[PDB]
């Protein structure tokens, strides 16, 4: 047409955005209204920046449509946005599968596809992204098992909670240098992979809550000295809490509730000086936690078979087939490679 463009990159970006304007079916907060003319950078949600290859040429560096209630799909023509570095699509209504054409987004660093209607198997396309360090696919309907290659890739944060994943956590989880890992609200069967002990130097927050995890808590969690959050709630985990928990000196949030843990609360929990919220409730514990440093630190010890405390589990409901100590090897996972503390 008659539209003059500043550089060839925005012209392809105009091709990509108008093609993706046709892919959008509902725009409640009138974002696509501005997608007229050749000035691509003025488009709502489109963000330009000087290209690192040539700073004089301005290029489309980011797309941020967070909290827009936009409905549609991701067309093949978005792969022309090779200069893209960030891509924010939280709280949208984009459905379908992630296009294979994202392979051309060589500079893409952070990818947020959270709270959408994406379906299909896990998109292996994100694994090919060289510059990717932030992957967010939470609250979608991706099916199947989590590929083992995901945890081999050097990523900072992986969010896959409340999705349609299955078939347990890959045993190579320890290989990922991720600082934040959330695989919660999923029907993942199996035990906590013992590879967590390798994650001590990089991991800072891990949440495996509301998964279908059964088995014992591996004691090598003590290597996680710089982890602040450790949540394993709403699981089928049985066994004793390892005395190695006290080695997690940076632990601030410790949630062990909604499980099947036997035995006593170790005395090494006393060493955690940064601890501010601790929850060991709806478990079959028989021994209470000491008096060490518990104001301003909230503890909930509800539904526990300890004789001393108030608001405890029923006498019937205690001394029950789960209240009984477990072999911890009668499960088919191999969480640990050295006998337990006892």
Ligand X SMILES: *[C@@H]1O[C@H](CO)[C@@H](O)[C@H](O)[C@H]1NC(C)=O
Ligand Y SMILES: *[C@@H]1O[C@H](CO)[C@@H](O[C@@H]2O[C@H](CO)[C@@H](O[C@@H]3O[C@H](CO)[C@@H](O)[C@H](O)[C@@H]3O)[C@H](O)[C@H]2NC(C)=O)[C@H](O)[C@H]1NC(C)=O
Q: Which is nearer to ligand X, 100 or 298 (CB)?
A: 298
189 binding partner (options another protein, ligand X, ligand Y, none; Cβ < 5 to 8 Å by kind)? ligand X
Site for ligand Y contains 228 (CB under 6 A): no
Site for ligand X contains 302 (CB under 6 A): yes
Q: Taking the CB of residue 293, how many other CB atoms lie within 10 A of it?
A: 13
d(CA 238, CA 15): 56
Q: Which of 250, 312, 323, 329 binds ligand X (CB under 6 A)?
A: 250
Give the max Cα distance, the chain.
Answer: 83
The length of the chain is 342
Site for ligand Y contains 2 (CB under 6 A): no
Tell me which residue of 266, 215, 264, 213 sits closest to 238, measured CA to CA. 215
Contacts of 161 (CB under 8 A, 6+ apart): 138, 139, 182, 183, 184, 185, 186, 207
Answer yes or no: are the C-beta atoms of 219 and 196 closer than 8 Å: no
Give the x/- contact pattern for ligand X in 221-240, rule: CB under 6 A. Answer: ----xx--------------
Tell me which residue of 25, 44, 47 sits closest to 36, measured CA to CA. 44
Structure tokens belonging to residue 222: 């003590």
Q: Which is nearer to ligand Y, 244 or 255 (CB)?
A: 255
Answer yes or no: are the C-beta atoms of 119 and 98 closer than 8 Å: no
Q: Taking the CB of residue 342, how many other CB atoms lie within 10 A of it?
A: 6
30 binding partner (options another protein, ligand X, ligand Y, none; Cβ < 5 to 8 Å by kind)? ligand Y
Total residues interacting with ligand Y, rule: CB under 6 A: 10
199 binding partner (options another protein, ligand Y, ligand X, none; Cβ < 5 to 8 Å by kind)? none
133 binding partner (options ligand Y, ligand X, another protein, none; Cβ < 5 to 8 Å by kind)? another protein
Site for ligand X contains 271 (CB under 6 A): no
Site for ligand X contains 249 (CB under 6 A): yes
CB of 303 to ligand Y, least distance (A): 10
Instruction: Using DSSP bridges, classify how beta strands 110-112 and 86-88 pair: parallel, antiparallel or unpaired.
Output: parallel
CB of 153 to ligand Y, least distance (A): 29
Q: Which is nearer to ligand Y, 119 or 298 (CB)?
A: 298
d(CA 183, CA 185): 7
Between the alpha carbon of residue 1 and those of residues 19, 32, 43, 99, 131, the distances in Å are 15, 20, 19, 28, 35
CB of 182 to another protein, least distance (A): 5
Q: Which of 32, 176, 235, 281 binds ligand X (CB under 6 A)?
A: 281
Site for ligand Y contains 30 (CB under 6 A): yes
Site for ligand Y contains 257 (CB under 6 A): yes
Residues that bind ligand Y (CB under 6 A): 29-30, 233, 255, 257-258, 277, 279, 281, 298
């Amino acid at each position: 047409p008659s539209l003059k463009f500043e550089n060839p990159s925005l012209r392809q970006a105009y091709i990509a955005l108008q093609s993706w304007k046709q892919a959008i079916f509902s725009d409640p907060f009138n974002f696509t209204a501005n997608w007229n003319g050749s000035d691509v950078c003025s488009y709502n949600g489109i963000f330009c920046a000087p290209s690192p290859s040539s700073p004089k040429t301005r290029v489309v560096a980011g797309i941020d449509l967070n909290h827009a209630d936009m409905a549609g799909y991701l067309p093949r023509e978005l792969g022309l946005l090779t200069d893209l570095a960030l891509f924010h699509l939280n709280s949208n209504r984009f459905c379908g599968e992630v296009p294979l054409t994202f392979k051309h987004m060589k500079l893409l660093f952070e990818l947020d596809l959270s709270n959408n209607r994406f379906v299909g198997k896990f998109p292996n396309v994100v694994l090919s992204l060289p510059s990717l360090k932030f992957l967010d696919l939470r609250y979608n309907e991706f099916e199947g098992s989590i590929p083992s290659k995901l945890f081999d890739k050097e990523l900072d944060a992986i969010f896959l909670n409340h999705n349609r994943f299955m078939f347990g956590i890959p045993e190579n989880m320890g290989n990922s240098p991720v600082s934040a890992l959330v695989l919660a609200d999923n029907d993942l069967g199996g035990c906590i992979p013992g590879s967590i002990g390798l994650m001590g130097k990089t991991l800072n927050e891990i949440i495996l809550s509301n998964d279908n995890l059964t088995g014992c808590l591996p004691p090598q969690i003590g290597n996680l000295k710089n982890v602040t959050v450790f949540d394993i709630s709403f699981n089928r985990l049985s066994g004793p809490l390892p005395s190695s928990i006290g080695n997690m000196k940076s632990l601030e949030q410790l949630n062990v509730a909604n499980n099947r843990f036997t035995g006593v609360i170790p005395s090494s929990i006393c060493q955690l000086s940064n601890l501010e919220n601790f929850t060991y409730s709806s478990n079959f514990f028989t021994g209470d936690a000491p008096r060490c440093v518990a104001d301003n630190v909230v503890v909930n010890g509800s539904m526990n078979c300890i004789d001393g405390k108030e608001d405890q589990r029923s006498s019937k409901e205690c001394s029950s087939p789960a209240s009984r100590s477990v072999d911890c090897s009668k499960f088919g996972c191999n969480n640990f490679f050295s006998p337990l503390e006892n």
